[PDB]
Design a protein around this ligand. Structure first.
Ligand SMILES: [Ca+2]
Ligand SMILES: [Ca+2]
Ligand SMILES: [Cl-]
Ligand SMILES: [Mg+2]
Length: 675
């Protein structure tokens, strides 16, 4: 009889353990490039001396040896360079074979076939399929990350933290990356077979999948539904009918499964952190060390001049003209890999942004941008350096505009307000890791200014009154809003100040929603005198126009005869009433755990359409939806439900409580699941 295979033992558990891919909730053979794995092949007879076995691995619709999307290698003994198979042992008709791949092989789904040369003939049989990923553990892989703890956080961690809020109140929200959840890896892999690049030229796309730079840039495009049937549809209007309020999501899992389940129809809706969380999931799943970055006072320069304009009218009203040019915060991602296209000094963290802000080559994609390069102002390098630099270090110009006259007049220039408290989750904990120093030289330093000029060069070759807005008291949705405008006269004369104020509800990006309060006043001040003008906004006044951001823009334009206007600005954040999660017993893997949701209604009216959304990788499969009954005025809701832990360690439980009066109240609970 001719030499032939009877069966193959992929030793899946063993290889996956060795290749750090055992966390994926999948039964497939998942491997990482540049690392070898062992298989056992039972032949029908012994391997003859004059016989030969040749392995054939191939990926994509056009497997080409030239493009490295197809490799044919013989069962040798001397481990070869790229793909190779070594016969480490023969027992009976069983061949113990060690197969290795190149650290440069394209990532994705491969199929393996065997060609046998026996008794003068040739026979072929398919052995099976496997998934090959980037290998952050391999010193020669470009995504290599040497530090154990860092690699664990940036690749293996599925529970995360994303900072939000404002420069006045930095907050955080939990996020379930869930890269290990059922079918997630599969979906993230399918994204590459659905991009514009892949449809344009499938043969070249698949070949380029050996480049984290390429893969990274594609994902920045494919995570938003713009141009290519991507995953998320952005919406910063404060009205999300036809979908879900961006603030209600708790992770990337429900989003990716919804995308697939709907025939790849846009998931409605998302905002920057939603795009970044979802991107972070794809990146970690594929093996590219990744993390989420939050830039407060993020500028959106729309004409590459490193400058952004914001306008107000003499009555203190923020004009749409630029109300969103400087977001309270903007969230993006960083990918870790070397930049062979830029040089040794630019390797490391690379900015990637899936939020559709600026088009790049006609498509909404952004990055990779070397963080190091951004700090030095080398915005001539790929990709999208100019835009990102502006996001973190653009100058802010305030303008006064009177539509009635057509007149426009510059009020002031601030070179240090853009790009502050750039944060990311600390490794192994929830602490805030500030990385501003990584994106720019110290504000107020000559370097900072020297770099600015350098970057701008590559793109294009006294007041007597001081004001300040302080928050008086507690700010919570349900309570009246109390502020005070503090004004002081630094001149030697007695000044009379005319003050025009407004309060608008906004979306964190700056999108103006509705005016909820306005007022004018004139106060006389003697030299060095300090006065306070109270600003009181009732719940009734803002409740109808306040969105899930729970933000309000407060402005006061003040002026004294013969002096330029003084503009005082302050965005405030109202806290949602507290939502609480409690475990009623010790948490052990595979053992039922009793949990409790607690919420008290602070309003004098009842809350209806109450829905609880709970999820957490390793704590429960998918998302749990509970319909809680109407909660009367000042009453408490106590919801019970059990979770069933599947993986030990530190897990993150997340919940979203939504009702007619309070959309997207959030909760998070750390739970140590024991074995
Ligand atoms: Ca897109
Ligand atoms: Ca600056
Ligand atoms: Cl999967
Ligand atoms: Mg501009």
């Amino acid at each position: 009889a001719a030499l032939g295979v009877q069966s193959i033992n992929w030793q899946t558990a063993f290889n996956r353990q060795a290749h750090h891919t055992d966390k994926f909730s999948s039964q497939e053979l998942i491997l990482r490039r540049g690392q070898n794995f062992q298989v056992l092949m039972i032949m029908n007879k012994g391997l003859g001396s004059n016989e030969r076995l040749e392995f054939i691995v191939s990926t994509g619709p056009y497997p080409s040896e030239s493009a490295m999307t197809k490799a044919v290698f013989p069962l040798s003994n001397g481990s070869s360079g790229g793909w190779s198979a070594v016969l480490q042992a023969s027992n009976g008709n069983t061949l113990t074979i060690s197969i290795s791949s190149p650290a440069s092989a394209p990532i994705g789904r491969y199929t393996m076939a065997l060609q046998i040369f026996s008794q003068g003939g040739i026979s072929s049989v398919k052995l099976g399929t496997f998934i090959l990923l980037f290998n952050p553990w391999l010193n020669v892989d470009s995504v290599f990350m040497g530090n154990h703890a860092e690699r664990e956080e940036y690749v293996q961690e599925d529970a995360g933290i994303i900072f939000v809020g404002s420069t006045n109140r930095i907050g955080m929200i939990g996020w379930n990356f869930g890269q290990f959840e059922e079918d997630i890896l599969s979906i993230c892999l399918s994204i590459l077979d659905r991009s514009l690049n892949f449809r344009r030229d499938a043969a070249t796309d698949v070949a380029s999948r050996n480049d984290p730079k390429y893969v990274g840039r594609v994902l920045s495009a494919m995570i938003n539904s713009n141009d290519d049937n991507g995953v998320l549809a952005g919406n910063w209007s404060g009205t999300y009918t036809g979908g879900r309020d961006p603030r209600s999501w708790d992770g990337s899992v429900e989003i990716l499964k919804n995308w697939k389940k709907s025939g790849l129809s846009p998931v409605r809706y998302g905002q920057c952190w939603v795009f970044a969380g979802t991107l972070n999931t794809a990146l970690r799943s594929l093996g590219i060390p990744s993390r989420v970055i939050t830039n407060f006072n993020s500028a959106h320069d729309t004409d590459r001049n490193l400058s952004v304009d914001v306008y107000y009218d003499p009555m203190g009203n923020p004009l749409d003209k630029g109300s969103d040019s400087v977001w309270n915060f903007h969230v993006w991602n960083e990918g870790w890999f070397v930049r062979s296209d830029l040089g040794p000094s630019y390797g490391g963290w690379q900015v990637l942004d899936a939020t559709p802000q600026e088009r790049s080559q006609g498509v909404f994609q952004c990055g990779p941008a070397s963080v190091i390069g951004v700090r030095e102002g080398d915005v001539q390098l790929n990709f999208d350096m100019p835009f990102i630099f502006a996001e973190v270090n653009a100058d802010r110009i305030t303008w006064l505009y009177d539509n009635t006259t057509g007149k426009q007049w510059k009020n002031s220039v601030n070179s240090h307000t853009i790009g502050r408290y750039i944060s990311t989750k600390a490794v192994g904990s929830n602490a805030r890791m500030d990385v501003t120093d990584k994106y720019k030289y110290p504000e107020g330093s000559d370097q900072e200014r020297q770099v600015f000029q350098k970057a701008l060069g590559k793109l294009k070759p006294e007041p007597s009154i001081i004001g300040k807005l302080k928050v008086a008291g507690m700010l919570a949705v349900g309570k009246e809003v109390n502020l005070v405008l503090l004004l002081k006269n630094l001149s030697r004369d007695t000044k009379t100040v005319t003050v025009n104020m407004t309060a608008w509800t906004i979306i964190y990006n700056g999108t103006l929603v509705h005016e909820v309060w306005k007022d004018s006043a004139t106060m006389s001040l003697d030299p060095e005198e300090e006065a306070e003008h109270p600003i009181k906004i009732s719940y009734a006044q803002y409740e109808r126009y306040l969105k899930s951001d729970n933000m309000i823009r407060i402005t006061a334009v003040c002026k004294v005869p013969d002096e330029s206007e003084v503009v005082v600005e302050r965005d405030i954040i109202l806290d949602n009433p507290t939502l609480t999660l409690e475990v009623l017993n010790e948490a052990r893997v595979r053992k039922p755990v009793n949990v409790q949701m607690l919420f008290s209604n602070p309003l004098d009216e009842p809350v209806r359409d109450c829905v609880l959304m709970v999820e957490g990788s390793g704590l429960l499969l998918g998302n749990l939806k509970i319909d809680v009954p109407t909660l009367g005025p000042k009453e408490r809701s106590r919801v019970r439900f059990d979770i069933l832990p599947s993986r030990s360690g530190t897990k993150q439980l997340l919940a979203d409580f939504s009702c007619n009066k309070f959309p997207a109240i959030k909760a998070m609970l750390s739970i140590d699941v024991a074995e």
